[PDB]
Amino acid sequence: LSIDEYQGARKWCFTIAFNKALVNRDKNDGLFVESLLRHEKYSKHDWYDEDTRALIKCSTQAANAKAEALANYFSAYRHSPGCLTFTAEDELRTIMERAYERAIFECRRRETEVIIEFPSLFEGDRITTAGVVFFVSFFVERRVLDRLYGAVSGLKKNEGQYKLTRKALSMYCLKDSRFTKAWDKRVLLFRDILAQLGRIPAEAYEYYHGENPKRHKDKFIEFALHYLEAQHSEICFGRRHIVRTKGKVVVDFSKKDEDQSYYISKNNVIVRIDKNAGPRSYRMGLNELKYLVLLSLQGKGDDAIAKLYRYRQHVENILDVVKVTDKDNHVFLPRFVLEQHGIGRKAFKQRIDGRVKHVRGVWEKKKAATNEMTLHEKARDILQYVNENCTRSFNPGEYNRLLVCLVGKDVENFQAGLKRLQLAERIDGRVYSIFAQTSTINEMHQVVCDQILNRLCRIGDQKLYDYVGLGKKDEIDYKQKVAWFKEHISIRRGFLRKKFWYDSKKGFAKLVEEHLESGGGQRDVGLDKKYYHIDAIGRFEGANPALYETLARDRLCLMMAQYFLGSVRKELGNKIVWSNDSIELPVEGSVGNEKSIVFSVSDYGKLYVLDDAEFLGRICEYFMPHEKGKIRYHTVYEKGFRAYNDLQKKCVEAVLAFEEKVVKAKKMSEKEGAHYIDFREILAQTMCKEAEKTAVNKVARAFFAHHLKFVIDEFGLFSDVMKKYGIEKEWKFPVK
RNA sequence: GUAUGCUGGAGCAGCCCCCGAUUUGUGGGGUGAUUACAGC
Ligand SMILES: [Br-]
Ligand SMILES: [Cl-]
Ligand SMILES: [Cl-]
Ligand SMILES: [Cl-]
Ligand SMILES: [Cl-]
Ligand SMILES: [Cl-]
Ligand SMILES: [Mg+2]
Ligand SMILES: [Mg+2]
Ligand SMILES: [Mg+2]
């Protein structure tokens, strides 16, 4: 259980993880800070306060030195325990505690209730098993950390606790596909589109399978932006960065940083079109984006982009003649413009009615959904109620502090917070008191829904229109608003549809299907069609509309994938064989009985195994020597990668048991001012021939680093030396 | 394609509802604003 209890061969699971951390720190020395900041690039809200961010920026050498120390400690029989001590002082400990409390908050606030406690990373000034798992997570792919946590967790008795604890501890891991030698990003986009399309649409997964992976995210926009930029040099989409409780989202059109994220806000992007006399910039929604993709795929991209470019000219012409212009042109103009010219004004009475109906509706739905809502949703509602009853509104610090109480199921500390607001005369005794009779987030949430609905279902008074936001003093000149509007134009919904398919009776989905059937690809989605329709419910009920739209956008993504593959160098486009339901690629090695690997649609998440071609070649050659031609991924995993992993555990356990026997038999000691005995210095004191010591070191190094850089004869010699020193294992290697 | 505080503008965009509909509609109505916005 404690980290001290892992001695000799029991260290093996840590040996494998930490050697991979060093394997990966040799590919990229920046991984500690990269991993700590990965999520915070996507957050307006600071993951870290200012001094924590400062510590993180300085920490690479410290963290890289600790990574090497622990790898040394876990890769030796006996190493000084000093490396397992982090003082309260320690930069790395502060960083780790902040990153971990942030990951726990991120897990808890997406749950509907707080069920479990999380393990401590430290006990006194000593790292725990959970602390060691957390430290290594920063350097390794998800699959390495899952393998470590699976070996060392005491929590697997409770599946829910095991997986939530794992979620927190693995928050900062690398994606399984993090490292590649591929230089053509069209190769990686091809794989990413295929992986996403092979994930089952969430709603269909829950119906057919609810208790391939589940699709969790819609990546249509991301893919569409990469495809439109690759096809149309005139077009460039806004990239996001955050300038540093809250940072500033800045949108720019700099391409220089390949991996920089596109700006996507509520299914809107910013497009810059460089035609004629200079660039023009628009906001474009999903609706216009998906029609632009459809038009681009059919060869009308240049024409569509010309019509978007000219859009601003039409708006500027209409703006001078709003009173007299055709009512059909009112669609391009925001409310404030039409209302300034006496078009579609509403009586304050009507504005009150619509506003109060809406806010009433919002709170009746919250009241009905309390048990299904997330802790973050419930906490935000409770905080809105307290904030709207405060003499002076929460500052960011006050808000954050109370949010942390509510998300953490700390109802005592939340109620101590209300007491402090009461003693400060910020809220009156009634507001403090309505919470006195509650002990749970759900109870508090119901009380708040009831207080708000009581306020909203009063016979309309002056206090009510202020409460629902109709009381604000607008002091901005119409002419300032018009000027702002002209530098921030958004494309009217249905614009491209009306320009190209005016008299079409075919919806978006049928237009996509007609292009797929007649366009010349003869491809369709590889997922079973039942994943895009529930036959048992009506055409328009529940998820069926959303799944039907998903079939059309997946078909767009397949055609984008077709464009990317078709665009890559013929050397690479001609080796691969892509069917509706499979990808076949050649495996290196196995000369005489040459080989290919066949990924089914359910395996497209694993196409990253192609990034280490030498390892896949040796896995097939050494674990599957008799197989020739086409091999299923499933077979490569079960007979190859799983077989390798089983052997690797036995060789690492063997090597550590060897060190223990040879250090204690030959009664060995460390140098004065050294932490462990070099494995060289241990072999130097063996009864082995040179050829035996060479092979032992090479086979050891291979299993420590997860590769196959040795020959079958050299494993023979390793196996001989283990047998000669008492440590046998059922190697099951070499293979029949 | 997470509204973690407050002020003010913006709902052409995004999203929702009603109506229509082998489905995502330049039909109708909303959206106490999500922000290529300006401030505390
Ligand atoms: Br290899
Ligand atoms: Cl990553
Ligand atoms: Cl490449
Ligand atoms: Cl009121
Ligand atoms: Cl098999
Ligand atoms: Cl070799
Ligand atoms: Mg405001
Ligand atoms: Mg609107
Ligand atoms: Mg605002």
Side-chain angles (χ1 to χ4, degrees), chain A residues 1-43 45-424 426-627 629-671 673-679 681-735:
Chain A
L1 193 130
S2 94
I3 199 54
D4 306 291
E5 294 198 37
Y6 298 92
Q7 297 301 330
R10 283 184 133 295
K11 293 184 163 188
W12 70 272
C13 49
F14 295 100
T15 310
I16 291 170
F18 274 86
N19 277 264
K20 199 71 198 296
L22 290 198
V23 170
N24 291 351
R25 190 219 54 193
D26 278 11
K27 298 179 170 154
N28 190 312
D29 77 310
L31 280 177
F32 193 62
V33 171
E34 175 191 311
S35 288
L36 278 159
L37 305 184
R38 175 176 303 113
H39 300 300
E40 186 181 55
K41 298 187 88 191
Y42 271 88
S43 191
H45 337 307
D46 293 349
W47 277 45
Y48 312 106
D49 70 39
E50 201 174 1
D51 291 79
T52 297
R53 192 166 297 89
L55 294 172
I56 290 169
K57 291 293 191 173
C58 294
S59 62
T60 304
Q61 282 83 40
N64 284 338
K66 181 63 57 161
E68 190 139 30
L70 294 171
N72 291 340
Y73 173 95
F74 285 112
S75 298
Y77 156 62
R78 188 173 67 216
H79 188 292
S80 53
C83 68
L84 295 174
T85 291
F86 305 61
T87 58
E89 214 192 72
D90 197 294
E91 291 80 18
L92 290 184
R93 181 169 181 174
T94 310
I95 291 160
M96 286 169 66
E97 292 284 24
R98 297 302 134 253
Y100 188 43
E101 81 167 43
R102 170 54 59 170
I104 287 168
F105 171 92
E106 293 300 328
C107 295
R108 287 192 185 293
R109 76 192 249 292
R110 297 205 217 157
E111 296 293 313
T112 68
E113 59 182 21
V114 161
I115 52 175
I116 61 126
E117 300 185 65
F118 289 85
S120 308
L121 303 192
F122 293 96
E123 291 295 310
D125 288 353
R126 167 135 295 178
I127 196 152
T128 68
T129 298
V132 166
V133 170
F134 193 60
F135 182 73
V136 85
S137 64
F138 298 104
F139 301 87
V140 299
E141 297 89 336
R142 191 158 288 278
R143 73 193 177 277
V144 174
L145 191 83
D146 287 358
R147 192 186 174 190
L148 176 53
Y149 187 56
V152 292
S153 180
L155 300 184
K156 276 144 57 190
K157 183 155 177 175
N158 191 319
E159 201 176 35
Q161 175 173 27
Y162 171 70
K163 290 180 180 173
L164 188 49
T165 300
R166 187 175 62 190
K167 201 190 177 224
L169 290 173
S170 77
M171 173 78 34
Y172 304 102
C173 288
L174 315 174
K175 70 183 191 281
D176 282 318
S177 62
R178 168 65 180 76
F179 298 111
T180 175
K181 281 197 205 288
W183 58 267
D184 193 357
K185 176 188 269 216
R186 300 175 291 191
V187 170
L188 303 180
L189 284 159
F190 178 75
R191 284 179 199 166
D192 288 345
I193 293 158
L194 284 192
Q196 178 73 355
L197 294 191
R199 295 200 248 245
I200 298 159
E203 309 98 323
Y205 185 84
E206 293 288 76
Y207 177 79
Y208 292 109
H209 301 301
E211 220 82 312
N212 312 239
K214 184 166 184 194
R215 200 188 293 191
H216 283 114
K217 179 71 174 181
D218 182 351
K219 309 194 183 190
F220 179 76
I221 294 177
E222 208 184 312
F223 298 157
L225 302 198
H226 287 287
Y227 163 76
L228 290 171
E229 284 188 342
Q231 190 75 98
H232 308 288
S233 56
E234 312 99 324
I235 220 191
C236 181
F237 294 100
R239 266 88 177 155
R240 78 180 276 123
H241 66 102
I242 300 195
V243 187
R244 302 276 158 204
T245 303
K246 204 173 282 158
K248 214 273 141 51
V249 178
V250 170
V251 177
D252 62 282
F253 301 95
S254 290
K255 287 198 194 194
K256 55 167 165 276
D257 186 333
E258 269 66 8
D259 204 76
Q260 201 172 7
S261 280
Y262 290 117
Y263 180 76
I264 311 165
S265 167
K266 308 293 158 176
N267 284 352
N268 293 308
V269 302
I270 313 302
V271 64
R272 177 187 75 191
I273 308 167
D274 186 9
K275 275 191 80 80
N276 301 353
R280 290 178 165 180
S281 275
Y282 306 91
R283 182 166 62 159
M284 287 191 74
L286 176 53
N287 195 83
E288 298 311 291
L289 202 62
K290 74 187 188 195
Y291 272 97
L292 179 54
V293 167
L294 181 50
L295 284 164
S296 170
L297 289 172
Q298 305 192 61
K300 298 210 183 301
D302 286 322
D303 199 29
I305 290 163
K307 295 183 182 297
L308 292 171
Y309 182 85
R310 289 185 259 129
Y311 184 104
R312 163 161 209 171
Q313 284 171 53
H314 191 242
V315 165
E316 288 201 340
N317 289 338
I318 297 321
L319 266 181
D320 297 321
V321 299
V322 176
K323 271 172 272 269
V324 290
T325 202
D326 198 311
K327 95 189 86 187
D328 293 337
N329 291 324
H330 295 176
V331 297
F332 300 107
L333 301 181
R335 278 141 208 240
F336 80 87
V337 170
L338 295 179
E339 279 178 19
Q340 175 72 5
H341 293 78
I343 302 157
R345 298 192 170 180
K346 293 172 287 197
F348 202 74
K349 168 68 214 89
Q350 182 196 342
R351 286 166 59 199
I352 289 160
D353 194 69
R355 181 62 56 78
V356 171
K357 180 199 192 292
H358 170 75
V359 180
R360 186 173 177 173
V362 166
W363 285 94
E364 292 178 333
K365 284 173 175 53
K366 291 173 177 282
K367 184 187 162 51
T370 300
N371 301 306
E372 299 80 50
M373 285 167 69
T374 70
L375 284 170
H376 180 73
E377 294 159 355
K378 279 176 292 206
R380 179 182 61 201
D381 285 350
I382 291 157
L383 290 176
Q384 200 191 309
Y385 172 77
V386 178
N387 211 5
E388 84 188 9
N389 282 283
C390 276
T391 53
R392 311 178 247 89
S393 289
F394 295 138
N395 65 39
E398 293 164 331
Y399 190 96
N400 177 70
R401 181 159 178 186
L402 294 178
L403 179 65
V404 166
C405 288
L406 285 174
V407 167
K409 199 199 193 215
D410 198 346
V411 171
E412 176 264 297
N413 276 117
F414 181 71
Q415 282 160 340
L418 292 180
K419 185 73 193 143
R420 289 194 301 272
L421 291 165
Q422 195 206 325
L423 294 177
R426 276 180 88 173
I427 66 170
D428 74 69
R430 213 187 49 70
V431 169
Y432 172 77
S433 179
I434 57 146
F435 289 112
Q437 270 280 39
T438 70
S439 61
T440 75
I441 311 312
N442 286 358
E443 280 165 2
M444 296 195 110
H445 186 256
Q446 286 284 304
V447 153
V448 155
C449 291
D450 293 343
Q451 292 298 320
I452 288 180
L453 286 168
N454 287 345
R455 188 162 186 184
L456 290 170
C457 304
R458 274 189 213 158
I459 287 174
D461 67 70
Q462 164 159 20
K463 302 154 56 61
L464 184 55
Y465 83 81
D466 232 303
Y467 181 65
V468 292
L470 296 173
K472 306 170 191 192
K473 180 154 142 58
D474 171 15
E475 313 196 39
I476 306 298
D477 196 311
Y478 172 71
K479 283 204 294 301
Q480 193 172 349
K481 298 183 185 186
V482 172
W484 186 87
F485 158 64
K486 294 154 75 166
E487 303 307 326
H488 300 92
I489 295 175
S490 306
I491 306 301
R492 173 73 198 188
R493 194 192 193 104
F495 177 73
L496 291 178
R497 182 185 176 76
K498 186 141 183 216
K499 286 289 175 167
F500 289 95
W501 285 287
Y502 191 116
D503 58 28
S504 188
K505 272 169 53 61
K506 293 206 188 199
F508 174 71
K510 282 239 256 295
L511 291 172
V512 168
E513 191 171 83
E514 176 205 305
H515 179 57
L516 201 69
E517 172 65 17
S518 77
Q522 288 188 356
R523 291 190 178 281
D524 204 346
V525 293
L527 281 186
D528 193 305
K529 280 291 158 52
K530 285 218 226 307
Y531 286 129
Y532 296 101
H533 195 64
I534 316 287
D535 272 327
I537 88 185
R539 272 200 312 274
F540 309 121
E541 314 192 329
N544 267 347
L547 292 171
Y548 187 76
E549 173 76 18
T550 302
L551 174 57
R553 293 179 194 161
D554 283 2
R555 281 171 166 164
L556 290 183
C557 289
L558 192 61
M559 279 176 299
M560 295 176 245
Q562 213 168 193
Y563 162 90
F564 288 128
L565 189 70
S567 293
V568 310
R569 64 186 180 283
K570 287 315 308 174
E571 296 99 295
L572 207 69
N574 289 333
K575 52 170 94 304
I576 188 173
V577 179
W578 182 31
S579 320
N580 271 1
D581 52 43
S582 80
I583 315 163
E584 183 204 341
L585 309 102
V587 182
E588 298 179 0
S590 278
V591 183
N593 41 17
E594 272 73 7
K595 267 151 149 151
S596 65
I597 185 172
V598 181
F599 299 80
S600 83
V601 169
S602 57
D603 308 317
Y604 288 172
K606 313 299 189 176
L607 286 160
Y608 69 86
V609 297
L610 301 172
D611 285 316
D612 199 324
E614 185 164 356
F615 183 64
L616 173 61
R618 274 166 185 250
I619 281 286
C620 289
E621 191 179 320
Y622 290 2
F623 291 89
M624 257 162 286
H626 299 314
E627 309 324 287
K630 300 184 327 176
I631 318 165
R632 288 176 187 179
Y633 174 77
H634 178 64
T635 301
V636 178
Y637 176 70
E638 285 298 332
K639 280 166 187 284
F641 296 128
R642 185 189 289 291
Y644 180 90
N645 291 350
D646 288 339
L647 183 50
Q648 174 192 39
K649 173 183 178 284
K650 294 156 177 183
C651 301
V652 173
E653 283 180 329
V655 170
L656 286 166
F658 179 72
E659 289 200 15
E660 179 165 328
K661 270 174 202 210
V662 166
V663 162
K664 277 189 317 185
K666 195 260 141 200
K667 219 168 49 174
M668 309 192 54
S669 290
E670 343 304 273
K671 304 293 191 59
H675 294 286
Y676 58 109
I677 319 182
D678 176 25
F679 182 63
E681 294 165 340
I682 294 188
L683 283 172
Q685 314 306 132
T686 40
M687 49 94 19
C688 296
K689 8 198 279 156
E690 299 300 69
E692 268 171 352
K693 294 188 262 154
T694 285
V696 155
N697 198 45
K698 194 184 283 197
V699 168
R701 281 204 303 116
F703 287 110
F704 282 35
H706 209 108
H707 66 67
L708 280 173
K709 295 166 193 323
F710 61 83
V711 301
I712 296 311
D713 286 341
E714 289 173 321
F715 186 90
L717 275 45
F718 165 81
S719 171
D720 292 342
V721 174
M722 291 309 106
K723 168 50 91 94
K724 278 137 120 298
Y725 267 90
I727 324 107
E728 224 210 289
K729 297 279 178 199
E730 203 194 343
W731 305 110
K732 294 177 188 168
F733 190 83
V735 172

